[PDB]
Amino acid sequence: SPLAAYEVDDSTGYLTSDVGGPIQDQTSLKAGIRGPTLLEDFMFRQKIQHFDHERVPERAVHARGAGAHGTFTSYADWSNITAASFLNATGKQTPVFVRFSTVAGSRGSADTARDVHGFATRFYTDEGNFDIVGNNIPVFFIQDAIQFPDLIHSVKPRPDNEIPQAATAHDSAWDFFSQQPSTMHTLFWAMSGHGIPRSYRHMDGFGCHTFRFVKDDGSSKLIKWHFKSRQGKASLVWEEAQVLSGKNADFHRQDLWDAIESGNGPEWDVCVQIVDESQAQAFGFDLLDPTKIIPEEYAPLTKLGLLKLDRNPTNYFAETEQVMFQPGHIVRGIDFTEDPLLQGRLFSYLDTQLNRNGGPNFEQLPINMPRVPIHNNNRDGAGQMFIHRNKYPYTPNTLNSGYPRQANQNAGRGFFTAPGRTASGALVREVSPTFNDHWSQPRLFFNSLTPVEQQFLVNAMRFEISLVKSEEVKKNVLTQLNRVSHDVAVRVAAAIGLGAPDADDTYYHNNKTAGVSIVGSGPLPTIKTLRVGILATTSESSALDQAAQLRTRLEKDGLVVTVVAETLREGVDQTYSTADATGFDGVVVVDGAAALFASTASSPLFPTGRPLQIFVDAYRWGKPVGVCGGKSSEVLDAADVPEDGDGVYSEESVDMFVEEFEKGLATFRFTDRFALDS
Amino acid sequence: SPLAAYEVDDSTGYLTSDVGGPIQDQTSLKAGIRGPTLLEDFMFRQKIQHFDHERVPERAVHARGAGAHGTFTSYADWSNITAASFLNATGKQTPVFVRFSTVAGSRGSADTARDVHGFATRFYTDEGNFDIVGNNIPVFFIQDAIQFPDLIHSVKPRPDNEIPQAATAHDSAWDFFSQQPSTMHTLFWAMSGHGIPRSYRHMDGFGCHTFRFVKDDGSSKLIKWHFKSRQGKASLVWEEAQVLSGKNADFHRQDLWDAIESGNGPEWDVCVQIVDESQAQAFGFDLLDPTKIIPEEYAPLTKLGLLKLDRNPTNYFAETEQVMFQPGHIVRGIDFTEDPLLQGRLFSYLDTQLNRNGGPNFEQLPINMPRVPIHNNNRDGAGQMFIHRNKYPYTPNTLNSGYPRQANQNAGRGFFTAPGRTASGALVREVSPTFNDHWSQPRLFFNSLTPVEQQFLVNAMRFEISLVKSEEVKKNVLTQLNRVSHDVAVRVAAAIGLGAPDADDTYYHNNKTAGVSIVGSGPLPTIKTLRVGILATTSESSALDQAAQLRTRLEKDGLVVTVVAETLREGVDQTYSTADATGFDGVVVVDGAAALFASTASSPLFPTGRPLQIFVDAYRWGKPVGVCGGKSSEVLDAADVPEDGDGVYSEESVDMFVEEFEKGLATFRFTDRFALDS
Ligand code: HDD
Ligand code: HDD
Ligand SMILES: [Ca+2]
Ligand SMILES: [Ca+2]
Ligand SMILES: [Ca+2]
Ligand SMILES: [Ca+2]
Numbered sequence A, B: 001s002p003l004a005a006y007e008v009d010d011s012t013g014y015l016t017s018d019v020g021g022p023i024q025d026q027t028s029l030k031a032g033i034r035g036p037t038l039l040e041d042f043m044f045r046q047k048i049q050h051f052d053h054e055r056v057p058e059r060a061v062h063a064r065g066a067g068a069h070g071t072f073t074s075y076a077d078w079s080n081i082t083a084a085s086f087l088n089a090t091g092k093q094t095p096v097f098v099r100f101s102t103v104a105g106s107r108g109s110a111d112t113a114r115d116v117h118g119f120a121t122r123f124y125t126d127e128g129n130f131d132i133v134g135n136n137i138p139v140f141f142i143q144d145a146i147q148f149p150d151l152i153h154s155v156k157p158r159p160d161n162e163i164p165q166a167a168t169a170h171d172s173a174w175d176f177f178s179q180q181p182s183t184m185h186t187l188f189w190a191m192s193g194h195g196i197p198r199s200y201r202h203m204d205g206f207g208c209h210t211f212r213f214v215k216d217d218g219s220s221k222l223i224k225w226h227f228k229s230r231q232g233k234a235s236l237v238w239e240e241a242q243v244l245s246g247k248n249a250d251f252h253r254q255d256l257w258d259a260i261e262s263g264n265g266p267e268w269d270v271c272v273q274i275v276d277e278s279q280a281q282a283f284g285f286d287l288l289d290p291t292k293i294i295p296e297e298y299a300p301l302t303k304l305g306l307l308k309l310d311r312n313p314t315n316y317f318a319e320t321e322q323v324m325f326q327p328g329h330i331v332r333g334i335d336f337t338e339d340p341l342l343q344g345r346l347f348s349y350l351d352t353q354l355n356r357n358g359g360p361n362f363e364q365l366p367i368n369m370p371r372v373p374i375h376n377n378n379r380d381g382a383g384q385m386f387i388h389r390n391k392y393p394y395t396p397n398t399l400n401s402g403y404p405r406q407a408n409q410n411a412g413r414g415f416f417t418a419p420g421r422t423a424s425g426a427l428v429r430e431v432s433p434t435f436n437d438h439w440s441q442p443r444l445f446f447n448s449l450t451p452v453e454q455q456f457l458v459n460a461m462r463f464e465i466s467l468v469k470s471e472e473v474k475k476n477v478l479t480q481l482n483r484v485s486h487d488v489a490v491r492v493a494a495a496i497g498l499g500a501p502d503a504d505d506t507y508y509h510n511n512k513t514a515g516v517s518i519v520g521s522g523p524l525p526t527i528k529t530l531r532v533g534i535l536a537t538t539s540e541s542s543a544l545d546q547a548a549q550l551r552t553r554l555e556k557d558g559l560v561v562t563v564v565a566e567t568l569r570e571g572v573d574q575t576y577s578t579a580d581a582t583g584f585d586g587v588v589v590v591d592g593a594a595a596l597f598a599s600t601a602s603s604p605l606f607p608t609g610r611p612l613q614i615f616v617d618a619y620r621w622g623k624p625v626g627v628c629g630g631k632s633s634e635v636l637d638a639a640d641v642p643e644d645g646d647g648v649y650s651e652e653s654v655d656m657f658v659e660e661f662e663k664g665l666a667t668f669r670f671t672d673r674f675a676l677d678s
């Protein structure tokens, strides 16, 4: 590991300058005890110069994100489908680093903004670094990389006032979506629960583009990358995400950090869809078009290996902030396709690192280094950390005996372009007519959601478009939505008091596809790491005993338990003052704490109505909630929470309460609590 | 308009490259209609290179902020105390640019984090740019600039995982505060309502340091800068600020931008305290110590002039993001003091612009350019915009006839150091013992707050210290708070289940000072721009009629009125789905909408209970609330709000309702709704 050599231990020792001279750093050097600071104070200036220069430009997109180390393990020798060395043996392990992100927000913006999310994975392979720079949504808004600044300017804050942060809920974004109909598929995904995932662990990763697997014999197949979560799929609801943005902007990065620290490092099956070159247009769309999925009914997933994240960084800046992904980080056995979005990405990711790093030697940062020898004639540049021994860095040479040697299909395990690839025709700035259906697959996605998930997506569009000031942009939005679904256009129009256009059935259909629904993906396969808030009181010795009971039961099953009370003490983790329903996946009130839930209840130690507000918010947001201990009756009445409700638990027995409640945690959300359009 | 020479209009015309060649930017150039993108596509690469390089490093501190243009007007000829040209005549006008900010958060962090706030003012004077780089709190955490990276590392996110964003509520910050007792004064300000101002317009600005006013005769006086809000002082409550951070991260920038667009540009009296050089140690502390205020009972404020902000930027990045303030931007008539915090700032703000701008010509950016000629021998450097005609840029010269000429006290209106300044003694890295009382002035501040203000400060400390993991740090924090106030230590200790240490009365006293309390500074002098939410319904045309009549009456008085209903139509500004009590300074329900406040009420158009939760939150956060029309029982009972409550209004008469309600908006907060420790 190039990181091991660069770890710096400051657990002992005297303070030094950056050149090893022992110094102090607490008082400036002055001309007398009340005098002016001296220019000759090098201790002051070296420390303050460093501080003054700590920041680097944030990523132009995906600025908000968090990373972890782990391991990829191949399930098989995949030589039969690719030459890729990291996939060439059963059990072969490759170190990884992953960064997850949002897209639009700056640094410091909230994790739980509604957005597309990044899922970028580096494989430090034995034949070079290989990055799969993916998103949690399989389709992208645009069909040509040249349009990326148009999309990103439109979603980012308006440039006169830089409002709003981390949001599409403004005129410019919806102007762009309504004028550029390619955007509909990703927009539908972003307006679904996929826009507000419960955690980075509860979302999938997608390469989006078609790539190629290339064998050593030169043959190739077309692939899509799918990283399928072993934790299951889960979402927040919007009114919860909005509160969580304020209460804990760091929720997704803490969730990931904690899961790794507790030995619950998240896992994905790294999968591909594999199809023949001859099927590029066989599925009713073009595989070069990054606004399209291959429905799993036409091409099943093959599991290639296991990705596990199991180690947090040491220094966030050095590792997470400085990791510099590139789809140009490719290895023998993988090739590009003529997807015009992918094509332009290859340029952008090499160039943008110059902005971030300030110089050309960014691959020398430890997080960016490979785990094999580097042999090339790249030289000099600001920040050059190598001392090259070859004083003849040109090819062809005799004075270095012809080294380094060219690598290609028949030498040195070189990368090679798939040799069956061709190009024909005019040099054109023209869009393929094969790309022109912008509406069928958005309809397929919408059809594939459950009725309450459809309602959530309509409600997200109603929320955002109601904040668009331009009546004209709003009419144009309804025109495009109407081409996907007349019903969606009518339901969205109702919230903004406009009439939807008449049905236009050109692209309407009733087809569905597996694997895109969150609500329909069934109970979570594991409840480990899910958060249970136990609302208790210091008033009643009964209440802390009940809490301690529930804690033992729930912690045995790997749940993260928080006992909440008025004040901290033995067994209490959190005060009411700092507690919020956004902090829990389930909420339990111990019946000993009933008095805290009365309308008349007041304390200087927390805001008026806090304990009850936690319970009511948890219920209203669809979470499993209950009262444990025998007078389950009251509390449920204070909350107007019906005791016969699905996901509402009422038991005197802790054993019975927990058994029932944990089934609620797997269900995760009780969708019967949300009203549907008639 | 002050920067009109630099504006670029794109309201007409064909797309060009940066060198004026007409182009297109929507489709990449490809080898065939389904082919790969060509390297010869310069249109693609210039556009994507620009996009890839849009970002610049955020400021090392104060990264989150917003700015506006305006004018400073002198009230008098201040020659009798300062040579400063911009102060030399009654009515003399100087253009300004101000940026307001938080301190700790990154770009995109929320405006309503608890923090110190920046208030940075540039005067484009006829004798050079003069910057007063201030905060909304008059005292700073630390007594020597060399400690700035220690403070900032401790309050910024923990550097392994970069958690938490824009918050002091973590172990490292409270470790620093408890180990560095100088921090107590600013800490008490930050934990007061000054940490969560209602807006940039409802906070003051302070220079913090003692500076000098220097007359043309060379005599000097010691000054403190005070910018006193002509809008009044106001705060959020914490449990409002947390929700607002999520619902509207842009709240302060939006409030400022909207105040300027509506012709309510905020105003401050620019004031100084003016004391003699002989009074440096006369007030029981040292005027070089930036942790101390001069109590107004010892030195009254002199009003120098009016600061008014009345014009929003055209391009946020170019003007707000790029403005580079420096305390080194000083003019004839002002000088520094030996405050060791100020002293080090002078280095920091010149150096750090090299990081932000990437090169040395940052004073050529339009926003940083002065409004008078530049004559000097500075040359070259990356990004050099000037074409210098003087080919002999050295002094002394004959070949340019000895120009530019040296400016000094006696010639050319030069800057000059106050000529009575001296230094004597050893060259020392020693702290003056005159700086050693870290506790009296925090106690002065605490004593000068009202009882519920003291409770709010205790509650902020209870909130944050309860989130500190380390029992060692919490004990150390109680040791320091106990030296300011035993009562504070006891009340804070109660929330975290530690015992407060025994009283230590060395620094205890009962002295108070005027003008530091928010709760005590009386009703607001103007209610213009304050926000009234009217909760109505589309289900009753009479409810919309009541709302229209309330709107007319409230808008007449310059209030910003939002009518809320289930759906948008004529006269309705927002839907319930997007509405929140954090968007209003007061909430009115029209009694024709009473049915939406029933516990039964449900709709697919907004979250369960949203109408009543807006009313309940507004009440519980202290805002004026009421019901207009005469039928108030159903709403007030559903909300558990007493009709006789202070700041609770029930009138049939719209005119009577508005007269009463407007007194409540001036009161701004009804502090009787918050519980006190006994
Ligand atoms: C033409 C430009 C362009 C286009 C079309 C895309 N991107 Fe990109 N993307 C960038 C230009 C870019 C960039 C400007 O080059 C970034 C900024 C930081 C960086 O290293 O690259 C980036 C960053 C970035 C990151 C963050 C990596 C990290 O965590 O550091 C992810 C996950 C993605 N992108 C994913 C995608 C996906 C899945 C795309 C479409 C399928 C996509 N981008 C299209
Ligand atoms: C020794 C370093 C140091 C110290 C002791 C301080 N600062 Fe500072 N401050 C900086 C180093 C710095 C900086 C690193 O140089 C920044 C970052 C961006 C910039 O232009 O300067 C800055 C920015 C900055 C800004 C933002 C200006 C803007 O909006 O662009 C404000 C308002 C202040 N500071 C105010 C203060 C006040 C009132 C201080 C104490 C009285 C103070 N700073 C002490
Ligand atoms: Ca906009
Ligand atoms: Ca969902
Ligand atoms: Ca540079
Ligand atoms: Ca080749």
Ligand SMILES: [Ca+2]
Binding pocket: B158, B170, B171, B172, B173
């Ligand atoms: Ca910490």
Ligand SMILES: [Ca+2]
Binding pocket: B192, B193, B194, B235, B236, B453, B456, B518, B519
């Ligand atoms: Ca207050």
